[model samples]
Target chain A: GSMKQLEDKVEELLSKNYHLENEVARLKKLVGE
Target chain B: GSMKQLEDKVEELLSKNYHLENEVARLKKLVGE
Candidate 1:
Protein backbone atom coordinates (compact mmCIF):
# COMPACT_ATOMS: atom_id res chain seq x y z
CA GLY A 1 0.00 0.00 0.00
CA SER A 2 2.78 2.42 0.87
CA MET A 3 4.63 1.70 -2.35
CA LYS A 4 1.47 2.18 -4.37
CA GLN A 5 0.85 5.50 -2.71
CA LEU A 6 4.40 6.58 -3.56
CA GLU A 7 3.89 5.53 -7.17
CA ASP A 8 0.72 7.54 -7.46
CA LYS A 9 2.42 10.62 -6.06
CA VAL A 10 5.23 10.26 -8.56
CA GLU A 11 2.77 9.93 -11.41
CA GLU A 12 0.94 13.03 -10.26
CA LEU A 13 4.09 15.10 -9.96
CA LEU A 14 5.37 13.94 -13.33
CA SER A 15 2.17 15.11 -14.99
CA LYS A 16 2.51 18.43 -13.22
CA ASN A 17 6.14 18.68 -14.31
CA TYR A 18 5.20 18.16 -17.95
CA HIS A 19 2.53 20.85 -17.71
CA LEU A 20 4.78 23.30 -15.85
CA GLU A 21 7.58 22.90 -18.39
CA ASN A 22 5.14 23.68 -21.17
CA GLU A 23 4.27 26.92 -19.42
CA VAL A 24 7.95 27.84 -19.26
CA ALA A 25 8.32 27.30 -23.00
CA ARG A 26 5.23 29.38 -23.71
CA LEU A 27 6.49 32.18 -21.48
CA LYS A 28 9.93 32.10 -23.17
CA LYS A 29 8.24 32.89 -26.46
CA LEU A 30 7.34 36.34 -25.13
CA VAL A 31 11.01 37.20 -25.58
CA GLY A 32 10.39 37.16 -29.32
CA GLU A 33 7.05 39.00 -29.28
CA GLY B 1 18.36 47.84 -24.00
CA SER B 2 19.53 45.35 -21.36
CA MET B 3 17.58 46.66 -18.36
CA LYS B 4 14.30 46.86 -20.21
CA GLN B 5 14.85 43.43 -21.69
CA LEU B 6 15.58 42.02 -18.26
CA GLU B 7 12.52 43.71 -16.83
CA ASP B 8 10.38 42.20 -19.54
CA LYS B 9 11.69 38.74 -18.75
CA VAL B 10 11.15 39.20 -15.04
CA GLU B 11 7.59 40.23 -15.66
CA GLU B 12 7.00 37.24 -17.90
CA LEU B 13 8.31 34.74 -15.37
CA LEU B 14 6.51 36.46 -12.53
CA SER B 15 3.32 35.97 -14.46
CA LYS B 16 4.33 32.41 -15.20
CA ASN B 17 5.07 31.87 -11.55
CA TYR B 18 1.62 33.07 -10.64
CA HIS B 19 0.03 30.64 -13.06
CA LEU B 20 2.36 27.83 -12.11
CA GLU B 21 1.71 28.27 -8.42
CA ASN B 22 -2.00 28.09 -9.03
CA GLU B 23 -1.56 24.91 -11.04
CA VAL B 24 0.43 23.41 -8.19
CA ALA B 25 -2.33 24.07 -5.75
CA ARG B 26 -4.82 22.64 -8.20
CA LEU B 27 -2.72 19.52 -8.69
CA LYS B 28 -2.24 19.10 -4.97
CA LYS B 29 -5.97 18.71 -4.78
CA LEU B 30 -5.66 15.65 -6.99
CA VAL B 31 -4.08 13.84 -4.10
CA GLY B 32 -7.51 13.77 -2.52
CA GLU B 33 -9.52 13.52 -5.71
Candidate 2:
Protein backbone atom coordinates (compact mmCIF):
# COMPACT_ATOMS: atom_id res chain seq x y z
CA GLY A 1 0.00 0.00 0.00
CA SER A 2 2.91 2.31 0.68
CA MET A 3 4.23 1.78 -2.81
CA LYS A 4 0.78 2.25 -4.21
CA GLN A 5 0.48 5.62 -2.51
CA LEU A 6 3.88 6.63 -3.77
CA GLU A 7 3.03 5.51 -7.26
CA ASP A 8 -0.22 7.37 -7.12
CA LYS A 9 1.58 10.49 -6.03
CA VAL A 10 4.09 10.06 -8.78
CA GLU A 11 1.31 9.62 -11.29
CA GLU A 12 -0.49 12.61 -9.90
CA LEU A 13 2.58 14.77 -10.05
CA LEU A 14 3.35 13.58 -13.54
CA SER A 15 -0.16 14.34 -14.64
CA LYS A 16 -0.03 17.74 -13.03
CA ASN A 17 3.37 18.32 -14.54
CA TYR A 18 2.14 17.38 -17.97
CA HIS A 19 -0.93 19.53 -17.53
CA LEU A 20 1.12 22.49 -16.37
CA GLU A 21 3.64 21.98 -19.10
CA ASN A 22 0.95 21.78 -21.74
CA GLU A 23 -0.75 24.85 -20.39
CA VAL A 24 2.56 26.67 -20.17
CA ALA A 25 3.57 25.64 -23.66
CA ARG A 26 0.34 26.99 -25.05
CA LEU A 27 0.71 30.17 -23.06
CA LYS A 28 4.38 30.32 -23.95
CA LYS A 29 3.21 30.83 -27.52
CA LEU A 30 0.21 33.12 -27.05
CA VAL A 31 2.15 36.30 -26.32
CA GLY A 32 1.77 37.51 -22.67
CA GLU A 33 -1.17 35.15 -22.69
CA GLY B 1 13.77 28.25 -10.04
CA SER B 2 14.17 29.31 -13.70
CA MET B 3 16.90 30.56 -15.99
CA LYS B 4 15.82 32.65 -18.96
CA GLN B 5 12.78 33.46 -21.04
CA LEU B 6 11.00 33.77 -24.36
CA GLU B 7 8.10 35.63 -22.87
CA ASP B 8 4.47 34.52 -22.70
CA LYS B 9 5.28 32.54 -19.56
CA VAL B 10 3.48 32.66 -16.25
CA GLU B 11 5.59 35.63 -15.20
CA GLU B 12 5.68 34.06 -11.79
CA LEU B 13 7.10 30.77 -13.03
CA LEU B 14 9.42 32.39 -15.51
CA SER B 15 10.82 34.82 -13.02
CA LYS B 16 11.43 32.00 -10.61
CA ASN B 17 12.51 29.03 -12.74
CA TYR B 18 13.56 31.35 -15.54
CA HIS B 19 16.12 33.37 -13.53
CA LEU B 20 16.36 36.30 -11.11
CA GLU B 21 15.68 33.94 -8.18
CA ASN B 22 18.08 35.73 -5.87
CA GLU B 23 15.75 38.63 -5.22
CA VAL B 24 12.99 36.87 -7.09
CA ALA B 25 11.13 36.23 -3.91
CA ARG B 26 8.90 38.96 -5.25
CA LEU B 27 7.52 36.48 -7.73
CA LYS B 28 6.50 33.77 -5.27
CA LYS B 29 4.34 36.16 -3.24
CA LEU B 30 2.22 37.90 -5.82
CA VAL B 31 -1.43 37.07 -6.05
CA GLY B 32 -2.04 37.98 -9.68
CA GLU B 33 -0.06 41.15 -9.07
Candidate 3:
Protein backbone atom coordinates (compact mmCIF):
# COMPACT_ATOMS: atom_id res chain seq x y z
CA GLY A 1 0.00 0.00 0.00
CA SER A 2 1.77 3.15 1.18
CA MET A 3 5.06 1.37 1.20
CA LYS A 4 4.54 0.28 -2.35
CA GLN A 5 3.83 3.86 -3.35
CA LEU A 6 7.03 5.02 -1.74
CA GLU A 7 8.95 2.29 -3.48
CA ASP A 8 7.61 3.43 -6.83
CA LYS A 9 8.56 6.99 -6.03
CA VAL A 10 12.07 5.89 -5.25
CA GLU A 11 12.28 4.08 -8.57
CA GLU A 12 11.14 7.17 -10.41
CA LEU A 13 13.74 9.26 -8.66
CA LEU A 14 16.41 6.72 -9.51
CA SER A 15 15.49 6.94 -13.16
CA LYS A 16 15.65 10.70 -13.03
CA ASN A 17 19.06 10.54 -11.43
CA TYR A 18 20.31 8.23 -14.14
CA HIS A 19 19.26 10.61 -16.86
CA LEU A 20 20.72 13.54 -14.99
CA GLU A 21 24.02 11.78 -14.74
CA ASN A 22 24.05 11.25 -18.47
CA GLU A 23 23.25 14.87 -19.07
CA VAL A 24 26.16 15.90 -16.88
CA ALA A 25 28.50 13.74 -18.90
CA ARG A 26 27.19 15.13 -22.15
CA LEU A 27 27.66 18.69 -20.96
CA LYS A 28 31.12 17.97 -19.67
CA LYS A 29 32.18 16.87 -23.10
CA LEU A 30 30.76 19.97 -24.69
CA VAL A 31 32.66 22.11 -22.21
CA GLY A 32 35.87 20.27 -23.12
CA GLU A 33 36.55 19.83 -19.43
CA GLY B 1 8.77 -0.04 9.85
CA SER B 2 9.31 -0.88 6.19
CA MET B 3 7.30 2.13 5.13
CA LYS B 4 9.52 4.42 7.17
CA GLN B 5 12.57 2.89 5.57
CA LEU B 6 11.24 3.46 2.11
CA GLU B 7 10.34 7.01 3.00
CA ASP B 8 13.89 7.68 4.11
CA LYS B 9 15.23 6.19 0.90
CA VAL B 10 13.05 8.52 -1.08
CA GLU B 11 14.41 11.49 0.84
CA GLU B 12 17.97 10.47 0.20
CA LEU B 13 17.37 10.01 -3.49
CA LEU B 14 15.58 13.33 -3.67
CA SER B 15 18.61 15.02 -2.16
CA LYS B 16 20.87 13.33 -4.66
CA ASN B 17 18.66 14.42 -7.50
CA TYR B 18 18.76 17.99 -6.23
CA HIS B 19 22.54 17.99 -6.30
CA LEU B 20 22.58 16.36 -9.69
CA GLU B 21 20.34 19.07 -11.07
CA ASN B 22 22.71 21.69 -9.77
CA GLU B 23 25.65 19.96 -11.34
CA VAL B 24 23.85 19.83 -14.66
CA ALA B 25 23.30 23.59 -14.51
CA ARG B 26 26.91 24.22 -13.69
CA LEU B 27 28.08 22.13 -16.60
CA LYS B 28 25.58 23.69 -18.97
CA LYS B 29 26.97 27.12 -18.21
CA LEU B 30 30.46 25.96 -18.96
CA VAL B 31 29.28 24.38 -22.17
CA GLY B 32 27.70 27.68 -23.18
CA GLU B 33 24.70 25.83 -24.43
Candidate 4:
Protein backbone atom coordinates (compact mmCIF):
# COMPACT_ATOMS: atom_id res chain seq x y z
CA GLY A 1 0.00 0.00 0.00
CA SER A 2 2.68 2.46 0.96
CA MET A 3 4.80 1.38 -1.97
CA LYS A 4 1.89 2.04 -4.25
CA GLN A 5 1.64 5.57 -2.97
CA LEU A 6 5.34 6.02 -3.40
CA GLU A 7 5.16 4.63 -6.92
CA ASP A 8 2.29 6.99 -7.71
CA LYS A 9 4.21 9.93 -6.32
CA VAL A 10 7.23 8.94 -8.39
CA GLU A 11 5.08 8.78 -11.51
CA GLU A 12 3.73 12.24 -10.78
CA LEU A 13 7.20 13.57 -10.22
CA LEU A 14 8.48 11.94 -13.39
CA SER A 15 5.75 13.55 -15.49
CA LYS A 16 6.36 16.92 -13.91
CA ASN A 17 10.08 16.44 -14.48
CA TYR A 18 9.42 15.70 -18.14
CA HIS A 19 7.34 18.85 -18.36
CA LEU A 20 10.16 20.85 -16.83
CA GLU A 21 12.64 19.28 -19.20
CA ASN A 22 10.54 20.09 -22.28
CA GLU A 23 9.84 23.61 -21.09
CA VAL A 24 13.53 24.07 -20.49
CA ALA A 25 14.30 23.02 -24.04
CA ARG A 26 11.70 25.45 -25.36
CA LEU A 27 13.09 28.23 -23.22
CA LYS A 28 16.57 27.45 -24.42
CA LYS A 29 15.46 27.65 -28.04
CA LEU A 30 13.71 30.93 -27.40
CA VAL A 31 16.86 32.32 -25.86
CA GLY A 32 19.02 30.79 -28.53
CA GLU A 33 17.02 32.49 -31.28
CA GLY B 1 7.35 42.47 -25.33
CA SER B 2 9.67 39.68 -26.35
CA MET B 3 11.94 40.38 -23.42
CA LYS B 4 8.93 40.26 -21.10
CA GLN B 5 7.92 36.86 -22.44
CA LEU B 6 11.43 35.57 -22.00
CA GLU B 7 11.54 36.88 -18.46
CA ASP B 8 8.20 35.29 -17.70
CA LYS B 9 9.33 31.99 -19.14
CA VAL B 10 12.47 32.10 -17.05
CA GLU B 11 10.47 32.88 -13.93
CA GLU B 12 8.14 29.97 -14.66
CA LEU B 13 11.02 27.58 -15.24
CA LEU B 14 12.72 28.65 -12.06
CA SER B 15 9.59 27.90 -10.08
CA LYS B 16 9.21 24.47 -11.64
CA ASN B 17 12.88 23.76 -11.17
CA TYR B 18 12.63 24.65 -7.53
CA HIS B 19 9.66 22.30 -7.18
CA LEU B 20 11.56 19.45 -8.78
CA GLU B 21 14.55 20.05 -6.56
CA ASN B 22 12.38 19.81 -3.49
CA GLU B 23 10.53 16.79 -4.77
CA VAL B 24 13.79 15.02 -5.47
CA ALA B 25 14.89 15.45 -1.90
CA ARG B 26 11.59 14.02 -0.74
CA LEU B 27 11.93 11.06 -3.08
CA LYS B 28 15.43 10.37 -1.95
CA LYS B 29 14.30 10.29 1.64
CA LEU B 30 11.46 7.94 0.80
CA VAL B 31 13.72 5.59 -1.11
CA GLY B 32 16.31 5.70 1.62
CA GLU B 33 13.74 4.71 4.22
- Among the numbered candidates, top TM-score falls to 3
Candidate 3 accuracy as lDDT: 0.88
Error of 3 at B30 (Å): 1.7
- Cα error, residue A12 of model 4, in Å, equals 0.2
Stretches of candidate 2 off by over 4 Å are B1-33
Q: What tens-digit string does per-residue lDDT give for candidate 3 at B1-33?
A: 688888888999999989889989999887885
Q: Which pairs clash inside model 2?
A: B1-B17, B2-B16, B2-B17, B2-B18, B2-B19, B3-B17, B3-B18, B3-B19
User: What's the TM-score of chain A alone for every prediction?
Assistant: 0.79, 0.79, 0.80, 0.85
Can you give the TM-score per candidate against the true fold?
Answer: 0.46, 0.46, 0.85, 0.49
lDDT by residue for model 4 (B1-33), tens: 245554455466567767766655555455546
What is the fnat score of candidate 3? Answer: 0.90
Model 2's DockQ score: 0.05
Model 2, B1-30: lDDT tens digits are: 122221223343443443333323343344
List clash counts for every candidate, in order: 0, 8, 0, 0
Separate DockQ for every predicted complex: 0.04, 0.05, 0.86, 0.05
Give lDDT tens digits, candidate 1, residues A1-33: 245554454556556666886755555454435
A1-33, model 4: which lDDT tens digit per residue?
244554454456566777766655555455446
What is the clash count of model 4? Answer: 0
- Identify the leading candidate in terms of DockQ: 3
Deviation from truth (RMSD, Å), model 1? 16.0
Tell me the tens digit of each residue's lDDT in model 3 across A1-23: 57789989999999998899888
Error of 4 at B12 (Å): 21
